[PDB]
Design a protein around this ligand. Structure first.
Ligand SMILES: [Mn+2]
Ligand SMILES: [Mn+2]
Lengths: 291, 309
């Protein structure tokens, strides 16, 4: 009556439900009114999830981008790998799936399988033409992310089997940035193709990755040290966040507005969420005794 | 335009949107009499509208917010600030988060400004019984007094319980009830009112879906139940509905289908409690009932830049 309450009331409740419309035919009874529909992407990206290989076919047959991906950039394949859903991975590839499609972090389905240890999949992908030399945001290739012996082996003997130049790949990005930085500084015309997604700039890539040389060379082209990306970040917000110490020093030596604010309201010190935090304050104490 | 009442929503709504851009947790100051006004004015509008709202697409439905003001502002910055778009929140505006006060006030304010384009349903955290235990009480007494709290209580007690869009989408914070056979049971519900540990209204605010369940099952929440996909189907097949939209549960991508897209769960509080790392959701329903999902990734979840090409 104080506890029987919750328990018995609910019981002497389920009871009434018995004779109630628990009998109302429990299927779909597809009325002539399925007026509500969901976006193709939402419906496709999910049909694969559960595993209704069957419906995906019709969805594709009707016209749905197989390489559709959620907010994080994960394709119907990325997820498939992450779920050791072998059958689907193949279904996807055999139906047109882009086997090398990167996620919003430079992770291709091979990275996924690698990082997760789903070797049988890593084997399938690698055989179906997966790119073992693909590098992501942190400069890692599936091999770097393989933290299981069996996996590392397969990838190791795969990079060496194909003669893939690993460092070549990690350096590729920075490398290019240098060329471009030189061309802009030299000629005197900046031709920076702001990146379609993040709205960030080369100044930001330099800072986040800690590419000291490209940065110094970039500032010398007189590129606004205080440019903000669509999220409202400063080339300092990055160098600090990902903790690229020397990247920050450079940014400061050029009077970077340290008081910059995030579109959500954060300082370079604020979202500098990672370790170093105190060091900046030191450089800050210097961005005054000399100005 | 000129005249009218005591509460100047224009003044409040404004002051509330002013921290847009300021660091999170930055407070929007105001009079307890302005807060108390907000409560009484909205409370009066709720009571003037049905308990079972009969709404009309197009509109953007939202799930829990739990005092995460900074994020709520972000939701409006995505779907557009009212009256730009029609809104329908599914409950749980307070508790847990840091700014329940800022969050609810703005919601109520907008409820007053555009009373026919803005709607708030009651979440399970809209009962003195529990938001007393989950921070809203403390956040009130911290900046005001227990009485201001009781005024909110009198307000929440008047919130609508459900909504039906274009006669095809049933919405409610929690879910179903083994007592809900005819909408009329909802309509004949006294208001103001509290939430019992058991009953039809308690189920609507508490119950949950569970694939591992067939028919009706018990709930690990210690209250109400859980329902299987088969109960969802019986329900829809009964009132001839297409979808059951709800929140109440944290879902990784802001939304989550159930019983073969017959039911959907929306959660609009990105990185809830800082514990989980979920995104916030928001369902857009146009005049055709073409439902799409606008996602809100956890803030401060910056993706490391790439040259691009
Ligand atoms: Mn809830
Ligand atoms: Mn909740």
């Amino acid at each position: 009556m104080k506890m029987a309450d919750a328990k018995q009331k609910r019981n002497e409740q389920l009871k009434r439900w018995i004779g109630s419309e628990t009998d109302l035919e429990p299927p779909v009874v597809k009325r002539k009114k399925t007026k509500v529909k969901f976006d193709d992407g939402a419906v496709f990206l999910a049909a694969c999830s559960s595993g209704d290989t069957e419906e995906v076919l019709r969805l594709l047959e009707r016209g749905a981008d197989i390489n559709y991906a959620n907010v994080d950039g994960l394709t119907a394949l990325h997820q498939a790998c992450i779920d050791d859903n072998v059958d689907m991975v193949k279904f996807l590839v055999e139906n047109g799936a882009n086997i090398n499609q990167p996620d919003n972090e430079g992770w291709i389905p091979l990275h996924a399988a690698a990082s997760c240890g789903y070797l049988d999949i890593a084997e399938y992908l690698i055989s179906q033409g997966a790119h073992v030399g693909a590098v992501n945001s942190e400069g890692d290739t599936p091999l770097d992310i393989a933290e299981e012996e069996a996996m590392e082996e397969l990838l190791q003997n795969e990079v060496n089997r194909q003669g893939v130049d690993i460092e070549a790949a990690r350096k590729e990005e920075e490398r290019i940035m240098l060329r471009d930085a030189r061309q802009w500084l030299n000629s005197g015309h900046i031709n920076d193709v702001r990146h379609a997604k993040s709205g960030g700039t080369a100044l930001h890539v330099a800072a986040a990755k800690g590419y000291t040389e490209v940065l110094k060379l970039l500032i010398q082209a007189r590129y606004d040290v205080n440019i903000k990306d669509y999220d409202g970040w400063t080339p300092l917000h990055a160098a600090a966040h990902w903790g690229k110490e020397e990247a920050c020093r450079i940014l400061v030596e050029n009077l970077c507005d340290m008081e910059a604010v995030n579109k959500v309201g954060q300082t370079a010190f604020d979202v500098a969420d990672e370790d170093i935090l105190g060091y900046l304050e030191e450089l800050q104490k210097k961005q005054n005794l000399l100005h | 335009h000129m005249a009218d009442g005591e509460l100047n929503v224009d003044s409040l709504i404004t002051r509330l949107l002013e921290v847009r851009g300021c660091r999170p947790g930055k407070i929007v100051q105001m009079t307890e009499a302005e807060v108390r006004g907000l409560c009484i004015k909205s409370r009066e509008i709720f009571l003037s509208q049905p308990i079972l709202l009969e709404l009309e697409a197009p509109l953007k439905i939202c799930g829990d917010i739990h005092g995460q003001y900074t994020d709520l502002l972000r939701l409006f910055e995505y779907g557009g600030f009212p009256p730009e778009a029609n809104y329908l929140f599914l409950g749980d505006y307070v508790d847990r988060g840091k700014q329940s006060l800022e969050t609810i006030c703005l919601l109520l304010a907008y409820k007053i400004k555009y009373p026919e384009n803005f709607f708030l349903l009651r979440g399970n955290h809209e009962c003195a019984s529990i938001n007393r235990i989950y921070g809203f009480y403390d956040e009130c007494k911290r900046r005001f007094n227990i009485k201001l709290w009781k005024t909110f209580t009198d307000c929440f007690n008047c919130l609508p319980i459900a909504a039906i869009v274009d006669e095809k989408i049933f919405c409610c914070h929690g879910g179903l009830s083994p007592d809900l056979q005819s909408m009329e049971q909802i309509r004949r519900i006294m208001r103001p009112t509290d939430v019992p540990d058991t009953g039809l209204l308690c189920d609507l605010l508490w119950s949950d879906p569970d694939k591992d369940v067939q028919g009706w099952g018990e709930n690990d929440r210690g209250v109400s139940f859980t329902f299987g996909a088969d109960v969802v189907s019986k329900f829809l097949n009964r009132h001839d509905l297409d979808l059951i939209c709800r929140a109440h549960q944290v879902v990784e991508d802001g939304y989550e289908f159930f019983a073969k897209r017959q039911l959907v769960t929306l959660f609009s509080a990105p990185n809830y409690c800082g514990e989980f790392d979920n995104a916030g959701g928001m369902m857009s329903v146009d005049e055709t009932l073409m439902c799409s999902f606008q996602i809100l990734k956890p803030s401060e979840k910056k993706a490391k830049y790439q040259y691009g090409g």
